[PDB]
Amino acid sequence: AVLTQPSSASSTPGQRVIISCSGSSSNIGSNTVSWYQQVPGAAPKLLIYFDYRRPSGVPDRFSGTRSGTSASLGISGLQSEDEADYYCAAWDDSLSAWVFGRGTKLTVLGQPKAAPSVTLFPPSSEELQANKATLVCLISDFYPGAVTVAWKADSSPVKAGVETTTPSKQSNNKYAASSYLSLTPEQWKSHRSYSCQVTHEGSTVEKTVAP
Amino acid sequence: NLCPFGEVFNATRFASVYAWNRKRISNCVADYSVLYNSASFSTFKCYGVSPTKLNDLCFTNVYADSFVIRGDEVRQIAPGQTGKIADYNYKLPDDFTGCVIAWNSNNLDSKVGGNYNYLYRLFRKSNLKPFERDISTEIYQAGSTPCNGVEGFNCYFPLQSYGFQPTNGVGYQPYRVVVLSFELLAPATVCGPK
Amino acid sequence: QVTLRESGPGLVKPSETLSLTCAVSLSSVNYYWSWIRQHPGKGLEWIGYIYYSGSTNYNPSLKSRVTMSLDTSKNQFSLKLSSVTAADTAVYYCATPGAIMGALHIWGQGTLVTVSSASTKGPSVFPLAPSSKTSGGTAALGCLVKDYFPEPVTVSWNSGALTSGVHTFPAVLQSSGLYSLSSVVTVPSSSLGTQTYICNVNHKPSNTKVDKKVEPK
Ligand SMILES: *[C@@H]1O[C@H](CO)[C@@H](O)[C@H](O)[C@H]1NC(C)=O
C-alpha cells in the first residue's frame, strides 16, 4: 500500500524498459525488494528477489537494483509475451507487514496490426423454444486492443440489451472481445435481419444474420 | 619512528565489512593527539580510556580494523549492539576498550548507477563472536534440503551488495570505519610521545 | 519443490465467515505460509502469514478479522476471514517464501471468492452451431454459457482432447446480476459432418457440469 509505482509503462519490441518503485526508510530503505510478474488470468510469478537475484528459469533480460529508498526493474529485449502487470514488494518494519506496489501495466506498442475476425451467431433454436433470444458477436485476432461494437436491427441501430466485454489477450498475443444482444423470439422473428458492426482503427467489418 | 596511522586512515581502497581489514601496529610511537584533532570525523567514540590519556599509556600491540558500511549502521559498531553488521559482519565486545572512528565516504565510494562492489554478510547460522571475521561464500541453507553450492529456493548466497549512489540520503551513503583496539599481553612497544 | 493448491466456497454471504484451505504437497517444514488476495482488476494485497512455530502476523488492515491455522493431519493451512463484506470479493492466493520471510517463491493457482446476497445459479448451455457463412474451409462452432452466478466457468472441448483453436471469452455481467460466457473453437469445415464436438462446461460454485453436443444445422 505504501510503495509507489508508476501506473503505466510503454516500449517497443526488442527495446528495454525500467519500472521504478519508491518507498520509505521503513521498507525499501532497510529491507529487500522483490519483483513479480502477473500475466492476466494467471497467478503472480517471482522475477527478482534480494534486489537483483533471479529465481530458477528467469532470463537475463530481467534485472533489479536497490538504492536508498528506491528500487528499479529492467526488462531487456521486450517481446509481446512480456505484456503484464509488474509489482514491487518489500517488508515494512514500521507496519510490521509485507507491502506491495499498486502495479505497473506494461504495454508493447509497436506490434504488427491485425484486423478483427468477426463471427455472428443467431439465436439457438433450442433457446427460442426456451422463449429467449441472444445474438453472439465474437471478435478475435485484432491488434491494437481497442475496438468499438455497434448493433443494428434491420438498418436501425440498437442500444437496448447490449453487453460487450473489454478486449482480452489470447494465446497468440492478439486481442479478442465479445458482444451480446438479448431479445425476444417475437423481436427476433419480427425483423428481416440483424447486424453486428465492429470498428477497429477507423475501419468497419459488418456481419449479418437473418431468421 | 611514527606508527603507520596514515596507511590505515588515508588509504585509497577500503575493504568490505564482511572481510574487514586488520593491521597490527607495534614497535613505534603514535600520537592520538594529532589523529583525534581533525574535524574530518563524523563519530569519534573511545570506550574506556580517553584520547588525552592514551598518549601516556603504552600497549604491546594496537589493532586498526577498517571497512565500509552505511551511515545508519555506525550505531552497530559499538559494545552491546545488534543488527546485520553487528551480528554477521563486525562484532565488538561488551567490555570494549578502544576507539570507533567513522567519516562520510560518498565522494570516494559512491558511483552513479550504483557502486555494488561493497558487500555485507546477509545470512549466518550464528552470531559472530567479538572480532571474528567470516569470509566464507558458502550457500546459506535456510531449509532442510541441501544446496550443493548452487543458489536456489531456500539456498541463498550469503553476501549482498551495498547500493551506493551519490543521490541518496546521508544514512544510505557509505562511511569509512576505523576501529582502534589496544592489547596488553610482552613489552609495550606502542606509546605516545609523552 | 512444494506445491500449493487452494480450495474455496466461491460464494459467501455478507457478514459471515469466509474460509479457505491451501493443501500442501509433509507439512512440518520450517516455512512461512502466507495468504494473498487480489480484488478484481486491482493490485495484490498481503493478508498475513503463519509460521510453523505457530507465530502469526496479519495485515494491520485485516488483523481483527483474520485467523490462520496449521493442520499437520490434512497437510494444509487455512484462512478464516470474519464479518465479510463486498470489499472482500477477490482471488485469494496461498503462497510461501520458504524458511526466510522475503520473496514469495511458490504460489497457488488461486480461488475466486464472491461476496453477495444473491443465490447460486446454474448455467444454461446452448450450442452455437456452424452455418453457411464456414469461412474458407475454416468453421467456427461454439457454446453459449448463459445466466450463471457467481464466477467462474471453465470450458473444455471433447474432454480436453480438442485444444487447438479454442477461445473461451471472458464473461459479461448483465444488469440481471448474472454472468454469460461464450467459447468458440476453430475446426475444419470439412469435419462438420463427421466429427462430434462436445463442450464441457464446469460451474464449481453450483456443483454443475454440462456436456453439450454441438450439431450443424
Ligand atoms: C590523512 O590526510 C590528511 C591530508 O589529506 C592529513 O591532514 C592527515 O594528518 C593524514 N593522516 C592521518 C589522518 O593520520
Numbering used by the authors:
A (entry chain L): 2 to 9, 11 to 27, 27A, 27B, 28 to 95, 95A, 95B, 96 to 209
B (entry chain A): 334 to 518, 520 to 528
C (entry chain H): 1 to 25, 29 to 35, 35A, 35B, 36 to 82, 82A, 82B, 82C, ...
Sentences from the paper on this structure:
Compared to neutralizing antibodies from COVID‐19 patients with generally low somatic hypermutation (SHM), these three antibodies contain over 13–22 SHMs, many of which are involved in specific interactions in their crystal structures with SARS‐CoV‐2 spike receptor binding domain. To elucidate the molecular recognition of S‐B8 and S‐E6 for SARS‐CoV‐2 RBD, X‐ray structures of Fab+RBD complexes were determined to 2.25 and 2.70 Å, respectively. Fab S‐B8 and S‐E6 bind the receptor binding site (RBS) with different approach angles and sterically compete with ACE2 for RBD binding, consistent with the competition assay.
However, the S‐E6 light chain contributes the majority of the buried surface with the RBD. CDRL2 50FDYR53 interact with the receptor binding motif (RBM) via multiple polar interactions (eight hydrogen bonds and three salt bridges) to E484, F490, L492, Q493, and S494. Moreover, VL F50 interacts with a nearby hydrophobic patch formed by L455, F456, and Y489, and VL S27, G29, S67, and G68 form five hydrogen bonds with R403, N501, and Y505 on the other side of the RBS ridge. However, residue 501 is located at the edge of S‐E6 epitope site with space that allows for accommodation of the tyrosine mutation at the site. The neutralization of N501Y+D614G PSV suggests that residue 501 is not critical in the binding site of S‐E6 since no significant change in the neutralization potency is observed between wild‐type and the mutant virus.
